[PDB]
Amino acid sequence: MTCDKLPKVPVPPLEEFIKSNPLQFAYVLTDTFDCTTRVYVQPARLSPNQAATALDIRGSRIITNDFVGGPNNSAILNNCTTGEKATWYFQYTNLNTPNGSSYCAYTCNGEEIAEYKCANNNNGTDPLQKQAVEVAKKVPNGDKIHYALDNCPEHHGCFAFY
Amino acid sequence: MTCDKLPKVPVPPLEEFIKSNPLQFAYVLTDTFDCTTRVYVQPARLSPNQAATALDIRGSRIITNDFVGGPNNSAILNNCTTGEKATWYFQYTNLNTPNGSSYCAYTCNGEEIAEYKCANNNNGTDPLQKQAVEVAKKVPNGDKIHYALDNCPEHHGCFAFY
Amino acid sequence: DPMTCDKLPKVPVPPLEEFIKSNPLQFAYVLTDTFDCTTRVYVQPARLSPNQAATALDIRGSRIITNDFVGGPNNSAILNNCTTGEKATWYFQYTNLNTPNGSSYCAYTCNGEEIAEYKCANNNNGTDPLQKQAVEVAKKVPNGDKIHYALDNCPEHHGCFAFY
Amino acid sequence: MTCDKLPKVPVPPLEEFIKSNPLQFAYVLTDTFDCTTRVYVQPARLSPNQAATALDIRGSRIITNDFVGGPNNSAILNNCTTGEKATWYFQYTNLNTPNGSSYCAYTCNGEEIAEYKCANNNNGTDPLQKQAVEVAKKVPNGDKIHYALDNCPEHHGCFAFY
Ligand SMILES: N#C[C@H](O)c1ccccc1Cl
Ligand SMILES: N#C[C@H](O)c1ccccc1Cl
Ligand SMILES: N#C[C@H](O)c1ccccc1Cl
Ligand SMILES: N#C[C@H](O)c1ccccc1Cl
Ligand SMILES: N#C[C@H](O)c1ccccc1Cl
Ligand SMILES: N#C[C@H](O)c1ccccc1Cl
C-alpha cells in the first residue's frame, strides 16, 4: 500500500525480454507513456559496460534508457538524452507464456509511485496484470494510473508502429 | 555501374539481424540517416501479417518501416507513418562474423540510387564495406554517398543512443 | 541541438509591416507536400474586420489556402483556416526580414513533440545562411525527416515571375 | 455612353493599392468575379521586370494578373496562368479616404464594356461608386453589370476569405 513496499520479483534474463518484443503499455502513471510500444535492445558489440537499452516509442518520438541490474532485484535506468537515473522494480513478470507476455514495473518517490508501466503483447488478458494494477492504484499517487491505449493515432499499414 | 544492376544477395533470416542489434550507418546517401542507429524488431505476437520492423533512431527521432520479402531478393518496406512502399536490396551482407556484422543496402530510382545504407557494429573495419561503397559511389547519384558519423551529438551515459 | 518540436526556438513575431514589405515570398522547405511550389503573400486585416486578424495566403497556381492569424502567448500565432475553421498554433524558428540580401524565415507548428508542418520562406533563392542551419535543426525533431526541398519540378510560368 | 469614351483617371501609386488591401468587388459584369476578394502584391525582390500582381481570390481559387502602366492612364494585365493580355482603365479611384477605399475599373471590347470591377472596403458607401455604376450600366453590354456579393458561400472564422 506504499511504493517502497511493493513486490520486487527477479529481473528475467535479457533474452526473455527480447523474445517478448514488441510490447505496448496498457497502464501507465504519467501521460508520457501513453500510446507507446516498448522494444528491448541488447548492448552494442563494442559497448564496454554492456548495458542493454529500453526503447519507448510513441509514434515518431523515441525515449531511450540504458539499464543495468542493481540490488534488491532493481534495475537502474540511465536516460540517454538527459543522463538522469531512476531505480526501477518489477511488481511481477510473466514473459513468453502460451498466451504471450505481460509485466508491471514501477519507480518510487519514497512511499509514492513516481512512474508505472504495465506492458503486454496479448491485449491485457493476463489475470496477473489485472490484480497488479488494482494493488498499484492504492499506493500514494497511484490514482493517476490510467489505461494508456484509448485514443491513439491511426496507423498506416504497420501493426505495432504509427 | 547503374543502380538496377547492383548485386542482390539473399536477405538473411530475421534472427541474424536481431542478433546483430544494434547497428549504426557508416555510409549513407541522403542526410536523413546521418548519426543513426538501426534496430530490427520481430512482428508483434498478434500481427496478422507477421511483418518485421526496421527502427531508424537518431536522437529522439525514430523512423519506422515494416518490411517483407519480395522477388529478386528484395525487401518491400512500408513506412509506418505514410504507407509509402520502397523496394530495397542488399548489395552484400556479412552478419555475426567473429569481427561483428556489416551490410550495405540500397533502393533505386531507375538507374540512379535513391538511398544507400551501410550498417555495421565494428566501427567500419569490414573490408567488404570499403569495396561496396567504392562500387556504389560510381552509380548515378552515388557521388552523394558519404561518411555518416562525423560531428554527431555528444552522448549522456549511453553508448549507442543520445 | 533542440531534440523535440516543443523545444524549438520561438523568436518574437516581427511587426506585420516587415512581412508585407517582404511580399511575395516562396517556400524553399516544407514538411507535407501541400506547400510545394507555393508562394506566400501576407495581407493586413480588412478595414471592417471585427477581430483585426491579418491573413496568410498560400498560393499554388490557381489554388489558394488562406489562414487568418492573431498573436498569442510565447511568441505564438494562432492560425484559423478560412475554409475549414481548423486552428493551429505556429511559431517562428527564426526570422531575418528585409536584410540587404532580402528576407527569410522558418516557421513551424507542432503535434506535441513532433513537427506537424514546417514552412521556410524566402525571396533570395535560399541564400540566407540562417535558413540552412534552421532546416538541419528542424529535420532532427520527431517527424522532421519529411521536411524537403519544395521547389523542384514545379509547373512552367506563363509570363509572370512569381505566379503561374 | 460608349466604353471607349469612359473616364480614364491616373493609376494611383502601388503603395495606395497595397494600403487598401484587401478589397471586395461590389459590382462586376461577368460571373467570374462574383464573391471575390482583391489583394495587390508588389513585384518579387528578384523580378527583372518589376511588374506588380493583382490577386483575385474566390474561396480556394485564385486568378492572378501581373500589371504594368501603359498609355492613356491604362494598365496592361498579363494573366499568369493563360498569358492573356487586357487593357484596363480606372473610371475613378478614391483610395484611403477616412471612410476607406473604392474604385471602378473596366476593359473594353471597342464600344462595348467587356469587364467591369468596382472594389471597396467600406460596404459600398462611397457616393462616387453609385454614380459610376449608373454610368457604366448605360454603356453597351453594361446591362449585365450586377451586385456581386449576394448569395456568397458561408465563412468559417475569417472575415475576408472563405
Ligand atoms: N501483439 C500485440 C499488441 O497488440 C500490440 C499492438 C500495437 C503495438 C504493439 C503491440 Cl505489442
Ligand atoms: N558496437 C558498436 C558501434 O560503435 C556503435 C556506436 C554507437 C551506436 C551504435 C553502434 Cl552499433
Ligand atoms: N503557416 C504559416 C506561416 O509560415 C506563419 C508562421 C508563424 C507565424 C505566423 C505565420 Cl502566418
Ligand atoms: N524574389 C524571388 C523568388 O525568386 C521567387 C520566385 C518565384 C515566386 C516567388 C518568389 Cl519570392
Ligand atoms: N480591378 C481591377 C483591374 O483588373 C486592375 C488591376 C490592377 C491594376 C489596374 C487595374 Cl484597372
Ligand atoms: N473591409 C471590408 C469588406 O467588408 C470586406 C468583406 C469581405 C471580404 C473583403 C472585404 Cl474588403
For A103-128, the DSSP string reads: EEEEEEETTEEEEEEEEESSTT--HH
The number of beta carbons lying within 10 Å of the beta carbon of residue A26 is 20
Give the span between the Cα atoms of A51 and C54, in whole angstroms.
Answer: 54
DSSP state for residue D9 in the 8-state scheme? B
Dihedral sign for Cα A135, A136, A138, A144, please: negative
The number of beta carbons lying within 10 Å of the beta carbon of residue B156 is 15
DSSP state for residue C32 in the 8-state scheme? S
- CA-based nearest residue to A64, from A46, A47, A51: A51
- Best of A17, A39, A152 to mutate (most B CBs within 10 Å, chain B): A39
The number of beta carbons lying within 10 Å of the beta carbon of residue D102 is 26
CB under 8 Å to A64, separation ≥6 — which residues? A53, A54, A55, A56, A79, A80, A81, B57, B158, B161
- Name the residue with cell 472564422: D157
Closest atom of ligand 1 relative to the A161 alpha carbon = 8
Cβ atoms D51, D66 nearer than 8 A: yes
Chains C and D: how many Cβ contacts under 8 Å?
A: 132
The number of beta carbons lying within 10 Å of the beta carbon of residue A99 is 14
CA distance from start to end of chain B: 37
- CA-based nearest residue to D4, from D116, D143, D102, D111: D111
CB under 8 Å to B94, separation ≥6 — which residues? B101, B102, B103, B126, B128
Method used to solve the structure: X-ray
CB pair distance less than 8 Å for C139 and B31: yes
Residue nearest to atom 3 of ligand 3 (CA): C107
Give the span between the Cα atoms of B79 and D60, in whole angstroms.
Answer: 31
Give the span between the Cα atoms of A49 and A158, in whole angstroms.
Answer: 34
Looking at the CA of D37, name the nearest ligand.
Answer: 6
CA of C44 to the centre of ligand 1 (A): 50
CB under 8 Å to C129, separation ≥6 — which residues? none
CB pair distance less than 8 Å for C85 and D21: no
Residue of chain D with shortest Cα separation from C17: D19
CB pair distance less than 8 Å for C142 and A61: yes
Residues of B with CB under 8 A from a CB of C: 31-32, 58-63, 81, 153
Cβ atoms B80, A161 nearer than 8 A: yes
B61 interaction partners in chain C (CB closer than 8 Å): 140-145
The number of beta carbons lying within 10 Å of the beta carbon of residue A24 is 21
Rounded to 5°, angle at Cα A133 from A30 and A21:
75
Residue of chain C with shortest Cα separation from A60: C142
Cis before A22? omega within 30: yes
Residue nearest to atom 6 of ligand 2 (CA): B160
Cis before C2? omega within 30: no
A61 interaction partners in chain C (CB closer than 8 Å): 4, 113-114, 142
DSSP state for residue C132 in the 8-state scheme? H
Give the span between the Cα atoms of C109 and B65, in whole angstroms.
Answer: 25
CA C59 to chain centroid: 12
Give the span between the Cα atoms of D19 and D14, in whole angstroms.
Answer: 9
- CA-based nearest residue to D75, from D65, D63, D62, D64: D65
Which residues of chain A form beta strands (DSSP E)?
23-28, 37-41, 52-58, 61-70, 74-79, 85-97, 100-109, 112-120, 146-147
Cell numbers linked to C90: 505556429
Segments in chain B forming alpha helices (H):
14-20, 127-136
DSSP state for residue C158 in the 8-state scheme? S
CB pair distance less than 8 Å for B60 and C144: no
- Whether ligand 1 lies within 6 angstroms of the CB of A160 is answered as yes
CB pair distance less than 8 Å for C141 and B60: yes
CB pair distance less than 8 Å for B66 and A159: yes
Looking at the CA of C125, name the nearest ligand.
Answer: 4
Name residue C12's amino acid: P
Distances (CA, A) of D44 to B7, C24, C116, D66, D80: 49, 6, 29, 11, 14
Distances (CA, A) of B39 to B7, D118, D127: 24, 65, 74
Residue nearest to atom 2 of ligand 1 (CA): A121
- CA-based nearest residue to D2, from D135, D124, D96, D158: D135
Q: What 3-state class would DSSP assign to C64?
A: strand
- D41, D42, D46, D47, best to mutate for ligand 4 pocket (most atoms within 8 Å of CB): D46
The number of beta carbons lying within 10 Å of the beta carbon of residue B138 is 11
Q: What is the DSSP string of D72-90?
A: TTEEEEEETTT--EEEEEE
